[PDB]
């Protein structure tokens, strides 16, 4: 029976540049003895020809008899013509998310290692390809061989080979709209939610179309029993989990060491609910050394026993069912932490996740939130293609007053409020007209860059004034602190009046939480007024008491 | 025979951009899509052998019920060496920002007869996603003028002006502009006749051989730079002052004979924010000779084709947005605003989108090269959700801002 050809992808070396001459090893009679067998396989089955000293190139072979097992093996190294292979598009960008799989009542593995292996190489490039077996004890002329096909190890079989089997099984996929035809590695994924009987008949049928290009296929595969470890999972029946996760309990803690216990929490927090990261990274920030042991902040090693309580439980998720709808919930952790749960019917979820603050020097629950938010709707659409309902511990009225006032634009895709404390909030609100009858503070402060000395304080309305003295302190640190004193000695409503651009910005992004406990113990203030109004005026023009209190000097 | 070759910059090879992910909906509809423009010849399915690779999304056009595809070619119009004239003088056409009315037809569907050259094709690459990676993305390649590529009007230039011509001898007084898929053309007619004016051209174009039957009708009549106004008040409270003498001193980084000293007398002294101060006749002169400098413009404002042009846009609240266009700090070559009630009074990005459209589109006219966006969102935020209101066929560039400027205010 005739056969339809697999046309070759024209392949080309990098920008001016040349086959590889990498002169052959010193093997062993014994090697040298199984080479020449094998390369006797490969010349009748076509994978390989003969070819005259003519062909200027040449990659090194390399043989293998592996782990006790007495079957010899060839190997060439074309890590050089690799170097100087072109780029191809690549088959690699990106990892299938188990939360995401579509299960199927049917599903047969097909061993295409062997259609993989008949895929016809470009001609002109086959010159390239060139090998040299050595002769026993060097006596005669080597054997020279170039390959016909994709030679195992090389650069763009691996793409090319896909590429091709993508194109024979296009047909057959669009001809049958009802099954899945999956490609990973070297095998083929058949799957439908048909009839037991009918797809026997659904792989007889592709068989038959494979044969076309003379390709017999085996359900062959090695069968294995679930769970399937996978890239890091175990994958069940009907549930997935990552693989078991033991971490490491000696007091040496070194960077590794935790850099280590990083990756694994982590990749643990896809499905185990609530994993704190924050304390046993913290340290890392600061540091250049993969070599040395590490102490504890304690809050660190508490969470390492949350973690491990968390983790003592078995945790599965679900595999996808699109009539089904997508939803997330979020919580707060604390301490610029959160986490998160993706499902479609309650106490059943997809996948689990957590999101830690962006460093910045202040910020606030609901940038945060939001933050969390795009990251969660980011991940939804890679993994299923749509944003999940938003079920956020937020009330509709905050997330109102918020955006409506925050200088930035921001969004949230649809999303309902969900009564589960702690609830997120705006904890202080500025006013936006001056208040009446509320006392005047015309604050400042300044240092001396040299000195590092500066002073900090107010002039009012009402007459009272305060000037304090600092040390190692910053022309900005005198500004916060300046507007701290007056928050301090003010009643209940207040009109703040600074020059301070820098303190204008902190405080006009409306931070509940900050690293300066400086701009820390402001915000607390902010907490307990009734009224603020934080007004902003240009410096040396001499006013109010940024000027009386500007010649205090 | 048909195809004019065309390369790349030295040292500049062809685009590898990453194709974002995309909603199940989008990638149905890409599909679809796709699929015809290869049974049409438009484009064709590629090899593994070609690495490069630009996004690609899908909307819902203006004023349209059907999805359409878009490509982002920033990167591959960066990486093009724009073709040129052979005689020196080249203009663009001011006379289009002076024209009364501007109405932009979208002729970029014609192009899809016109085959593009073979050693370029290949850097049209790009690929419709798989849902979570499942399976291998599809790959194509433009075979004809694809619409987003700026080199792509360039080649059809000299053509469409053949096709131009028949209108262009008929209306002398009339001004024509091409700015990637569209048309623009402008005119000091009578608006009823204006606009009768363009099935002129929208039909005659037909019979050239020859998606194009909805309205978006735009005028320049505005101040090139809106002038900045202080406030008339009877009475003034320590507060007004101060706000007042803050807008001032920002006013006199543009316009250096801004003096706030008798302005700013006034403020000495510590009193209640909300207390009443009356004015002066030292100040009153100061407001007054201040008025006057506002009203008259800055001096020696020149534009550079060399340098690029920074539009930046405030959110003043209830869907009120300022904004200004400049290549150099300070020396506005157009202000504006955008506070219209078509976009979501509920959607702060999907408002920001439509008023970076309009800004971009207002800069083509007056210019002819879009301005670089200065955004006030964080990044992940418009990246995220910006192409899900994008209604046009090109893409600006955009920075970020992160910082609340203290100008909010000063300009509305
Ligand atoms: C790793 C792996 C996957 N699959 C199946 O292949 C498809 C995907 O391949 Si995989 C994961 C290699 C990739 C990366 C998406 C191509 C699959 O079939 S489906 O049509 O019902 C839908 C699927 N998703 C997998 O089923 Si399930 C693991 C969901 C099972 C629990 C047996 C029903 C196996 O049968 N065995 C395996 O070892």
């Given at each position: 029976?005739?056969?339809?050809?697999?046309?070759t992808?024209?392949?080309?070396?990098?920008?001016?540049?040349?086959?590889?001459?990498?002169?052959?090893?010193?093997?062993?009679?014994?090697?040298?003895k199984?080479?020449?067998?094998?390369?006797?396989?490969?010349?009748?089955?076509?994978?390989?020809?003969?070819?005259?000293?003519?062909?200027?190139?040449?990659?090194?072979?390399?043989?293998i008899?592996?782990?006790?097992?007495?079957?010899?093996?060839?190997?060439?190294?074309?890590?050089?013509?690799?170097?100087?292979?072109?780029?191809?598009?690549e088959?690699?960008?990106?990892?299938?998310?188990?939360?995401?799989?579509?299960?199927?009542?049917?599903?047969?593995?097909?061993?295409?290692?062997?259609?993989?292996?008949?895929?016809?190489?470009?001609?002109?490039?086959?010159?390239?390809?060139?090998?040299?077996?050595?002769?026993?004890?060097?006596?005669?002329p080597?054997?020279?061989?170039?390959?016909?096909?994709?030679?195992?190890?090389?650069?763009?079989?691996?793409?090319?080979?896909?590429?091709?089997?993508?194109?024979?099984?296009?047909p057959?996929?669009?001809?049958?709209?009802?099954?899945?035809?999956?490609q990973?590695?070297?095998?083929?994924?058949?799957?439908?939610?048909?009839?037991?009987?009918?797809?026997?008949?659904?792989?007889?049928?592709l068989?038959?179309?494979?044969?076309?290009?003379?390709?017999?296929?085996?359900?062959?595969?090695?069968?294995?029993?679930?769970?399937?470890?996978?890239?890091?999972?175990?994958?069940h029946?009907?549930?997935?989990?990552?693989?078991?996760?033991?971490?490491?309990?000696?007091?040496?803690?070194?960077?590794?060491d935790?850099?280590?216990?990083?990756?694994?929490?982590?990749?643990?927090?896809?499905?185990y609910?609530?994993?704190?990261?924050?304390?046993?990274?913290?340290?890392?920030?600061?540091?250049?050394?993969?070599?040395?042991?590490?102490?504890?902040?304690?809050?660190?090693?508490?969470?390492?026993a949350?973690?491990?309580?968390?983790?003592?439980?078995?945790?599965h998720?679900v595999?996808?069912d699109?009539?089904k709808?997508?939803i997330?919930?979020?919580?707060?952790?604390?301490?610029?932490?959160?986490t998160?749960?993706?499902?479609?019917?309650?106490?059943?979820?997809?996948?689990?996740?957590?999101?830690?603050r962006?460093?910045?020097?202040?910020?606030?629950?609901?940038?945060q939130?939001?933050?969390?938010?795009?990251?969660?709707?980011?991940?939804?659409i890679?993994?299923?293609?749509?944003?999940?309902?938003?079920?956020?511990?937020?009330?509709?009225?905050?997330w109102e007053?918020?955006?409506?006032?925050?200088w930035?634009?921001?969004?949230?895709?649809?999303?309902?409020?969900?009564?589960?404390?702690?609830?997120?909030?705006?904890?202080?609100?500025?006013?936006?007209?001056?208040?009446?009858?509320?006392?005047?503070?015309?604050?400042?402060?300044?240092?001396?860059?040299?000195?590092?000395?500066?002073?900090?304080?107010?002039?009012?309305?009402?007459?009272?004034?305060?000037?304090?003295?600092?040390?190692?302190?910053?022309?900005?640190?005198?500004?916060?602190?300046?507007?701290?004193?007056?928050?301090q000695?003010?009643?209940?409503?207040?009109?703040?009046?600074?020059?301070s651009?820098?303190?204008?910005?902190?405080?006009?992004?409306?931070?509940?939480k900050?690293?300066?406990?400086?701009?820390?113990?402001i915000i607390?203030?902010?907490?307990?007024?009734?009224?603020?109004?934080?007004?902003?005026?240009?410096?040396?023009?001499?006013?109010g008491?940024?000027?009386?209190?500007?010649?205090?000097? | 025979?048909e195809?004019?070759?065309?390369?790349?910059?030295?040292?500049?090879?062809?685009?590898?951009?990453?194709?974002?992910?995309?909603?199940?909906?989008?990638?149905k509809?890409?599909?679809?899509?796709?699929?015809?423009?290869?049974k049409?010849?438009?484009?064709?399915?590629?090899?593994?052998?070609?690495?490069?690779?630009?996004?690609?999304?899908?909307?819902?056009?203006?004023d349209?019920?059907?999805?359409?595809?878009?490509?982002?070619?920033?990167?591959?119009?960066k990486?093009?060496?724009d073709?040129?004239?052979?005689?020196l003088?080249?203009?663009?056409?001011?006379?289009?920002?002076?024209?009364?009315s501007?109405?932009?037809?979208?002729?970029?569907?014609?192009?899809?007869?016109?085959?593009?050259?073979?050693?370029?094709?290949?850097?049209?690459?790009?690929?419709?996603?798989?849902?979570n990676?499942?399976?291998?993305?599809?790959?194509?390649?433009?075979?004809?003028?694809?619409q987003?590529?700026?080199?792509?009007?360039?080649?059809?230039?000299?053509?469409?002006?053949?096709?131009?011509?028949?209108?262009?001898?008929?209306?002398?007084?009339?001004?024509?502009?091409?700015?990637?898929?569209?048309?623009?053309?402008?005119?000091?007619?009578?608006?009823?006749?204006?606009?009768?004016?363009?099935?002129?051209?929208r039909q005659?174009?037909?019979?050239?051989?020859?998606?194009?039957?909805?309205?978006?009708?735009?005028?320049?009549?505005?101040?090139?730079?809106?002038?900045?106004?202080?406030?008339?008040?009877?009475?003034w409270?320590?507060?007004?002052?101060?706000?007042?003498?803050?807008?001032?001193?920002?006013?006199?980084?543009?316009?250096?004979?801004?003096?706030?000293?008798?302005?700013?007398?006034?403020?000495?002294?510590?009193?209640?924010?909300?207390?009443?101060?009356?004015?002066t006749?030292?100040?009153?002169?100061?407001?007054?000779?201040?008025?006057?400098?506002?009203?008259?413009?800055?001096?020696?404002?020149?534009?550079?084709?060399?340098?690029?042009?920074?539009?930046?846009?405030?959110?003043?609240?209830?869907?009120?947005?300022?904004?200004?266009?400049?290549?150099?700090?300070?020396?506005?070559?157009?202000?504006?605003?955008?506070?219209?009630?078509?976009?979501?009074?509920?959607?702060?990005?999907?408002?920001?989108?439509?008023?970076?459209?309009?800004?971009?589109?207002?800069?083509?006219?007056?210019?002819?090269?879009?301005?670089?966006?200065?955004?006030?969102?964080?990044?992940?935020?418009?990246?995220?959700?910006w192409?899900?209101?994008?209604?046009?066929?090109?893409?600006?560039?955009?920075?970020?801002?992160?910082?609340?400027?203290?100008?909010?205010?000063?300009?509305?």
């Amino acid at each position: 029976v005739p056969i339809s050809p697999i046309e070759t992808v024209p392949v080309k070396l990098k920008p001016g540049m040349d086959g590889p001459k990498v002169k052959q090893w010193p093997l062993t009679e014994e090697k040298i003895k199984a080479l020449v067998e094998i390369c006797t396989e490969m010349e009748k089955e076509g994978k390989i020809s003969k070819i005259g000293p003519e062909n200027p190139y040449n990659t090194p072979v390399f043989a293998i008899k592996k782990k006790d097992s007495t079957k010899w093996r060839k190997l060439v190294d074309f890590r050089e013509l690799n170097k100087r292979t072109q780029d191809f598009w690549e088959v690699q960008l990106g990892i299938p998310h188990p939360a995401g799989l579509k299960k199927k009542k049917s599903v047969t593995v097909l061993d295409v290692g062997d259609a993989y292996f008949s895929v016809p190489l470009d001609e002109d490039f086959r010159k390239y390809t060139a090998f040299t077996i050595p002769s026993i004890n060097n006596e005669t002329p080597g054997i020279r061989y170039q390959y016909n096909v994709l030679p195992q190890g090389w650069k763009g079989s691996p793409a090319i080979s896909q590429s091709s089997m993508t194109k024979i099984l296009e047909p057959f996929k669009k001809q049958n709209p009802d099954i899945v035809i999956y490609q990973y590695m070297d095998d083929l994924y058949v799957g439908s939610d048909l009839e037991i009987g009918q797809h026997r008949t659904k792989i007889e049928e592709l068989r038959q179309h494979l044969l076309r290009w003379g390709l017999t296929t085996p359900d062959k595969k090695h069968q294995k029993e679930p769970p399937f470890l996978w890239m890091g999972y175990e994958l069940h029946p009907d549930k997935w989990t990552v693989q078991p996760i033991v971490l490491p309990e000696k007091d040496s803690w070194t960077v590794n060491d935790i850099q280590k216990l990083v990756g694994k929490l982590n990749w643990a927090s896809q499905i185990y609910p609530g994993i704190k990261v924050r304390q046993l990274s913290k340290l890392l920030r600061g540091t250049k050394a993969l070599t040395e042991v590490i102490p504890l902040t304690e809050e660190a090693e508490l969470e390492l026993a949350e973690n491990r309580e968390i983790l003592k439980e078995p945790v599965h998720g679900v595999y996808y069912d699109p009539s089904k709808d997508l939803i997330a919930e979020i919580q707060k952790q604390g301490q610029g932490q959160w986490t998160y749960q993706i499902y479609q019917e309650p106490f059943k979820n997809l996948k689990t996740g957590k999101y830690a603050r962006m460093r910045g020097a202040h910020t606030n629950d609901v940038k945060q939130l939001t933050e969390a938010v795009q990251k969660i709707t980011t991940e939804s659409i890679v993994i299923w293609g749509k944003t999940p309902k938003f079920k956020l511990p937020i009330q509709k009225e905050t997330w109102e007053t918020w955006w409506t006032e925050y200088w930035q634009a921001t969004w949230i895709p649809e999303w309902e409020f969900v009564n589960t404390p702690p609830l997120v909030k705006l904890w202080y609100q500025l006013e936006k007209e001056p208040i009446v009858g509320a006392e005047t503070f015309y604050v400042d402060g300044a240092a001396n860059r040299e000195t590092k000395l500066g002073k900090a304080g107010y002039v009012t309305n009402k007459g009272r004034q305060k000037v304090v003295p600092l040390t190692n302190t910053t022309n900005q640190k005198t500004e916060l602190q300046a507007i701290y004193l007056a928050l301090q000695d003010s009643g209940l409503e207040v009109n703040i009046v600074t020059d301070s651009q820098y303190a204008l910005g902190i405080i006009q992004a409306q931070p509940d939480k900050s690293e300066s406990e400086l701009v820390n113990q402001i915000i607390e203030q902010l907490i307990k007024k009734e009224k603020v109004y934080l007004a902003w005026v240009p410096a040396h023009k001499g006013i109010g008491g940024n000027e009386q209190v500007d010649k205090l000097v | 025979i048909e195809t004019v070759p065309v390369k790349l910059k030295p040292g500049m090879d062809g685009p590898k951009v990453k194709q974002w992910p995309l909603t199940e909906e989008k990638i149905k509809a890409l599909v679809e899509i796709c699929t015809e423009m290869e049974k049409e010849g438009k484009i064709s399915k590629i090899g593994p052998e070609n690495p490069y690779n630009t996004p690609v999304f899908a909307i819902k056009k203006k004023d349209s019920t059907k999805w359409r595809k878009l490509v982002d070619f920033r990167e591959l119009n960066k990486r093009t060496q724009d073709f040129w004239e052979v005689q020196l003088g080249i203009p663009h056409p001011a006379g289009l920002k002076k024209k009364k009315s501007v109405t932009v037809l979208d002729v970029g569907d014609a192009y899809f007869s016109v085959p593009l050259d073979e050693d370029f094709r290949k850097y049209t690459a790009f690929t419709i996603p798989s849902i979570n990676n499942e399976t291998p993305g599809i790959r194509y390649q433009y075979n004809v003028l694809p619409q987003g590529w700026k080199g792509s009007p360039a080649i059809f230039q000299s053509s469409m002006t053949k096709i131009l011509e028949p209108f262009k001898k008929q209306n002398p007084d009339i001004v024509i502009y091409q700015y990637m898929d569209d048309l623009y053309v402008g005119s000091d007619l009578e608006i009823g006749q204006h606009r009768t004016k363009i099935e002129e051209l929208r039909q005659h174009l037909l019979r050239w051989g020859l998606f194009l039957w909805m309205g978006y009708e735009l005028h320049p009549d505005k101040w090139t730079v809106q002038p900045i106004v202080l406030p008339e008040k009877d009475s003034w409270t320590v507060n007004d002052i101060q706000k007042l003498v803050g807008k001032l001193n920002w006013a006199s980084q543009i316009y250096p004979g801004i003096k706030v000293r008798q302005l700013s007398k006034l403020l000495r002294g510590t009193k209640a924010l909300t207390e009443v101060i009356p004015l002066t006749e030292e100040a009153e002169l100061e407001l007054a000779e201040n008025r006057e400098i506002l009203k008259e413009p800055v001096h020696g404002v020149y534009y550079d084709p060399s340098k690029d042009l920074i539009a930046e846009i405030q959110k003043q609240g209830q869907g009120q947005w300022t904004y200004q266009i400049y290549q150099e700090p300070f020396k506005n070559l157009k202000t504006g605003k955008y506070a219209r009630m078509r976009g979501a009074h509920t959607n702060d990005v999907k408002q920001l989108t439509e008023a970076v459209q309009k800004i971009t589109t207002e800069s083509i006219v007056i210019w002819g090269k879009t301005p670089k966006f200065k955004l006030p969102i964080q990044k992940e935020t418009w990246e995220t959700w910006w192409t899900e209101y994008w209604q046009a066929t090109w893409i600006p560039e955009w920075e970020f801002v992160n910082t609340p400027p203290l100008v909010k205010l000063w300009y509305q």
